[PDB]
From a paper:
In mammals, the most abundant and best-studied NDPKs are NME1 and NME2 (hereafter abbreviated NME1/2), which are closely related isoforms (88% sequence identity) with similar functional attributes and localization in the cytosol and nucleus. NME1/2 are hexameric enzymes that catalyze the reaction XTP + YDP ⇆ XDP + YTP by first transferring the γ-phosphoryl group from XTP (usually ATP) to residue His118, and then from the phosphohistidine to YDP, where Y is any of the four common (deoxy)nucleosides. Briefly, each NME1 subunit within the D3-symmetric hexamer comprises an antiparallel four-stranded β sheet flanked on either side by a layer of helices. In this study, we showed that NME1 binds AcCoA and CoA with similar affinity via a binding mode distinct from that of canonical ADP and ATP substrates and critically dependent on the CoA 3′ phosphate group.
Efforts to cocrystallize murine NME1 with the ligands led to high-resolution (1.96 and 2.2 Å, respectively) crystal structures of NME1 bound to SucCoA and ADP, and a somewhat lower (2.6 Å)–resolution structure bound to CoA. The CoA 3′ phosphate group forms direct H bonds with Lys12, Tyr52, Asn115, and His118 as well as water-mediated H bonds with Arg88, Arg105, and the Gly119 backbone. Compared to ADP, the α and β phosphates of CoA are displaced upward and are solvent accessible, pointing out of the pocket to direct the CoA pantetheine end away from the protein surface. Since the latter affinity has not been previously quantified, we analyzed the NME1:CoA interaction by isothermal titration calorimetry (ITC).
Residue numbers in the entry:
A (entry chain A), B (entry chain C): 2 to 152
C (entry chain B), E (entry chain E): 0 to 152
D (entry chain F), F (entry chain D): 1 to 152
């Protein structure tokens, strides 16, 4: 319950525009803990399975080639309702709909360059975590401030 | 008209997690003027009178003992709608409903660990102010910017 | 593309300069993805403010608004980007800071309606009128931003 | 006994009026030191004169007392290893024109007569100043959750 | 007085503008306690820069410096206060960003010397030469900060 | 060339538990350096030994390996002109008491036994450690879009 995990990935425009540290900071100060972290240049084959739900969409080719044109920061975060609250912290998928104070609302403009991706559901979280991370690369530890975050 | 006061308290999980300065900062940059500030470990008796409207709730015992298990920072802020807008700045009482940009929305997760308390009304404010503070501990002064914060 | 070149006029009111919010104000517009086209430091005359606020000359606060806008220096800015008029309003917040949400410029830094530190063009033609009013075409600097291909698709 | 040394930190009236209170506490909190005492107060010229008793012969003594009395102060007591020494380093030089960027004074003030913050110059100056503004009641003892990550 | 009003000329270079460091630089001078007197956004010409760097015409990097300062728009600013020429130079950092200390402007956002984001008047005399060069007397705004009596005794 | 030099920067277990990861990365990003390698790992007691092989004859070597092993670390590789030397300056002195405000250790830690972050002391140390924590596959080469504004 207090160990739910979600997949968060900083897109190539986030790395290029230098927003990797700020994004990691909003999740740290919130109270979530990092379980996995890697710096990687994804293959278009990997992205196709990650975006297999959108293969019918007209933007699919441009989305896969944009996600491949640069490195990404693949993370795994853990905490009570990390999937949902993470989506709230991220904002709406279109930055034009995001409210200020959200990651997209403070840092990006266009839908095709929305700097960050969050797992839309627990089922989408477990599918994406097992896709980008192996079980070895996920680190298990207890934050020194757990008893001050949860009861 | 601009002299209304509210009671703001940083809960024991807000002191332990190093969130005291940032919390005071949001009320300083907002345009509010600090009137009372103290550092205190509230006795269970001082808390039960503060939470007397919640004595019939099942969590009342765990709420008092958690608020007593650590020191709190008790503050009094004055300004136009410092009670109401203070509730807005704090956000919703359960952090899972709070919006990003609010204090709880940026820094905490669970309801029982929401780092901060605010007065819910002008009637709650007066009672809470007169309960934790004596009339002398309250400092009355004029901010050098009040002609730029108010007209 | 030609839509990504949309422009808006953002002014930092005298209370925003006095309370030292100019750099933080420009920071939210820089970190968002928008580009600086014009920037000047000015003391607007009452005559200049009246034409800028001509659609409020019937309101009772008009005289108090113009003199307060003239009682100090302002920071006139022009910004460009996709929906810079509409999203700038969002980042600014609601005109009354008691309505603004935390995270907005007005929600985070100001209290009273008469001292809401910042102005934003409400529409594209209000932006078109306000940019041509405070800026001459010479004062506007068009440059390609080094991260443009990472802001846009 | 060194992971318990306390120092007295005071935010001057100009530090409050300009709204640097949370910013000052933030640097002490993130540094690793623990907040032991806190109070908001408009100092009387009596306690000021005992606080600055070492400067009674200096020409600025009168203007310093009435300035520190012209507004409210935030009186703080911080605990940690060498909090008296590294507290002075964090503060910067007493003349803000001598403070280095990154310090509280080097970042936030200009003139020496308005240097927003005061630091205890020594452990003996601290315990005198601690006993001056703070009674042993108003000092809170507790263990921070990250102490074992701050100390060995 | 006169000392409580000395002016310097701090310029944000094109790499500071391109990398989104305009708001951060203004915020540091604001929170220091200095008074914004003038501010302009400008693509300065090769000729304006030659006179600005006239004491460096006999240096091999002089031609690549003027073309880099012309390759983008700059933020020209004027700040007023006590010892703001000197203190501003300490805030900027050392001109070689590898010598600038952390906490300075160049120590925090700069690596190479040919890309040192910002310039500061080295002396009061260089200030009054540079200020009169980039700005006209009209564009300089004199006003009284609301916190002056808490910055100066 | 010298715009491509790399260094090895690790965030110790106390830097992670006290939530400093995003801040440490942000200071390197805003400086202008490029992120080359990034991983999150619980280093084994065999890995930090060869990392701290020069300190095996120091009395603290035992408590340092097991402290480095007591939590997860964030191993990083950064590339830029003089990133090894300028990395050390940004970190500050190894003894946080000697670190200057504005550095990572002058802002965020107190004790030598808990200085949150590590930096490569030299180019040859950097290349020895980069090949110790990272394999050539995990290092991502990409041209930062603002390169022509960071370097001339
Ligand atoms: O419109 P919307 O409902 O806000 O977008 P959706 O949630 O359906 O998009 C799901 C995915 O498709 C992407 N997508 C949607 N529209 C896109 C477009 N026009 N171009 C590129 N990608 C797009 C989204 O970025 C999202 O990926 P993400 O999880 O990394 O943000
Ligand atoms: C919406 C509702 C259903 C739930 O919201 P709620 O969190 O329980 O109610 P509140 O937000 O007003 O709680 C206020 C305080 O109680 C605490 N609290 C509330 N629920 C808590 C819980 N489940 N566990 C621990 N603390 C809780 C909160 O920490 C909060 O702290 P605060 O001083 O900072 O404000 C609420 O309206 C409700 O409970 N109504 C019925 C209350 C009632 O009938 N009381 C009579 C006796 S049962
Ligand atoms: C919202 C509206 C309907 C009137 O509501 P309102 O309470 O006046 O709030 P507004 O949105 O008009 O605020 C406009 C400005 O008037 C000023 N203002 C508003 N209320 C004020 C008050 N009580 N005292 C002083 N100034 C006030 C503010 O400065 C405000 O923000 P700005 O300076 O950044 O522009 C207004 O949009 C309106 O009058 N529309 C009709 C004509 C028009 O303005 N059209 C817009 C162009 S399409
Ligand atoms: O010599 P110094 O610059 O004063 O530094 P010291 O360490 O000796 O401190 C002596 C006191 O004299 C104070 N002082 C020096 N000049 C002063 C002035 N013109 N007005 C008020 N106080 C002054 C200093 O502020 C310092 O007090 P502080 O620690 O509260 O700032
Ligand atoms: C030669 C003279 C200028 C003294 O040298 P100096 O006092 O060391 O000059 P500075 O320390 O202020 O720095 C030299 C200027 O040329 C720039 N510069 C120096 N070396 C440079 C290089 N290798 N590439 C590009 N620019 C360089 C510096 O950035 C600085 O300009 P800036 O303030 O806009 O950043 C002397 O003629 C005089 O002052 N009169
Ligand atoms: C390491 C050495 C330089 C002296 O150490 P120093 O003066 O304290 O400063 P340094 O930064 O250079 O190295 C100190 C290391 O020892 C650790 N250390 C020192 N004292 C410690 C203590 N009491 N407890 C825990 N760790 C300690 C430090 O944590 C640091 O490791 P870190 O980077 O993770 O923080 C010395 O032992 C030496 O000569 N080493 C040779 C290795 C080298 O640098 N070769 C370069 C060839 S070009």
């Amino acid at each position: 319950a207090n160990s739910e995990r979600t997949f968060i990935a900083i897109k190539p425009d986030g790395v290029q525009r230098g927003l990797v540290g700020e994004i990691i900071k909003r999740f740290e100060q919130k109270g979530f803990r990092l379980v996995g972290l890697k710096f990687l240049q994804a293959s278009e084959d990997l992205l196709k399975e990650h975006y297999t739900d959108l293969k019918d969409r007209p933007f699919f080719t441009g989305l896969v080639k944009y996600m491949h044109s640069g490195p990404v920061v693949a993370m795994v975060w853990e905490g009570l309702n990390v999937v949902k609250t993470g989506r709230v912290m991220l904002g709406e998928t279109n930055p034009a709909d995001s409210k200020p104070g959200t990651i997209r609302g403070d840092f990006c403009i266009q839908v095709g360059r929305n700097i960050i991706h969050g797992s839309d559901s627990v089922k989408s979280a477990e599918k994406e975590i097992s896709l980008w991370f192996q079980p070895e690369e996920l680190v298990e530890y207890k934050s020194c401030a757990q008893n001050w975050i949860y009861e």
